[PDB]
Amino acid sequence: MWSNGAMYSSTDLNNGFRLNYLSNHNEPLTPMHLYNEFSVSEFGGSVTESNALDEIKYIFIQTTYANSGDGR
Amino acid sequence: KYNVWDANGLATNRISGVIHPRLVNSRLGINSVAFDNMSNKLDVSSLIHNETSQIIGLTPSTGSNVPHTRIMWSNGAMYSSTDLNNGFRLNYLSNHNEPLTPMHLYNEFSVSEFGGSVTESNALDEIKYIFIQTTYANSGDGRFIIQALDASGSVLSSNWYSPQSFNSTFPISGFVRFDVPTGAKKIRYGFVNSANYTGSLRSHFMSGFAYNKRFFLKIYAVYNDLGRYGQFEPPYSVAIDRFRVGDNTTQMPSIPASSATDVAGVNEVINSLLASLKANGFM
Amino acid sequence: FFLKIYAVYNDLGRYGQFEPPYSVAIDRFRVGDNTTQMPSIPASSATDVAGVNEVINSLLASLKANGFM
Amino acid sequence: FFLKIYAVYNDLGRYGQFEPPYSVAIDRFRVGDNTTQMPSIPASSATDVAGVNEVINSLLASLKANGFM
Amino acid sequence: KYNVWDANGLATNRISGVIHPRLVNSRLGINSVAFDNMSNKLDVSSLIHNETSQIIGLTPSTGSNVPHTRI
């Protein structure tokens, strides 16, 4: 389900994805990191932006709870 | 004519209503804009066709705005095999009630299948209305066509729609409504050309991507009775890994055509092929 | 482990909502692909003339039987 | 024939609702798999040291043509 | 026994109701006919198995009314 990244180890798949270091959340992501990318709000040149409007307003992310961890 | 008639028509508005479901599958129903703006529309309908364009264009192409394969369609062809971004091939049809041939891009499915022990007065119809949503363009000769047919192939009802018909959410996309007559046994739908030449989806339905950069088609069936015959939707099972997580096969690396004939080059090529098959999931 | 991400649209379906492709009229999407994983065929070193031909026949039979044709 | 089974959750999505996998950024789930079933290749009996090679070339060409590659 | 008990039972009727979701995942819940007629049923549930029959039968067969594989 992922375009970039890798699995942590090829001798025990139950460790999961590999998580690589990133200093802060506004830094660029590289092909080593596990991430996906998609494009939104694609309108033609004959359409003014003031008329077409935005495509996505909010994004809600659900996932599992844990008490601590360095992963993000 | 209607139960709810929505006439909201400004591009900068954002409408979102709630409509009781039993008003939508009735003798008069609601108009196309009201269904556009009905946030709970999945309470009366399910998708019978959903399709959008890929992200990465296939070879050869100059863009990725339309579908590059005919994977979703049982008939027809791609316009040109040297530029896949032209899209589907639109063949000429004189009027929307004419018979569709295997040259035209279209699909067919059957509705209201009850056994011989059930009277038709008791079983009833399966689909009441059909709603189609497609991208908007200001002009073009291509048409989206839909037909309802009885048991012996004859056309009970039919209609087609022009690019500027899809304008309930100008300037991006819109809905149109089709009325399924009683006694229909089959439904055909697809894309054709209304003028007498072979056209392409890019330049004769999407007007050269002047308004939309991503083609999509969604077709909603409003059922006569919620789930009497069972709604249509993709298959799934929580217990099978093929449907729970997906299929893990991957495309194989290219193996160059081999000409080795000393009785061992062939054996090595076969062993390499079997190794790649085992490695990439086919096994 | 599970991960679910939800996009709230600025306007319900102005640009077309994202969801898996489907067609009631195509058997690929209506019921799924019927291909099955092929049984393991061991790497073969038979070199007279005939072992290679027999392995090719075995592979073609398995392809035909398991849905790849 | 059809069969649909509905699970009413004790709490809406505490453990995560079950539903088919999808990703708007991945083409296998966004548009589907473009692999098509290959045309039938008859089992071959050519053992002059090159008929086998031609059959293998044909099989590789079919694989490349029909998506598997 | 129940919260909502639907006893509609004629073949020519077409029922379509709305029920608050919190009445369905409760100690008593609703009966099978109310859930049949609950048009907002995807607010409290999801399909854990969905299967229908193919359009074109596989070889060999005399019809296409049931699933032809154990997929």
Coordinates of C-alpha atoms in Angstrom, one line a residue, chain B residues 96-99 147-150 152-158:
Chain B
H96 CA -30.1 7.4 -29.0
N97 CA -32.7 4.7 -29.8
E98 CA -30.6 2.9 -32.4
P99 CA -29.0 -0.5 -31.7
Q147 CA -30.9 2.5 -22.9
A148 CA -33.5 0.4 -21.1
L149 CA -34.4 -2.8 -23.0
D150 CA -37.1 -5.4 -22.6
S152 CA -36.4 -9.4 -26.6
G153 CA -33.7 -6.8 -27.1
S154 CA -36.2 -4.0 -28.1
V155 CA -35.6 -0.5 -26.7
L156 CA -38.3 0.5 -24.2
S157 CA -36.6 3.8 -23.4
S158 CA -33.4 5.6 -24.1

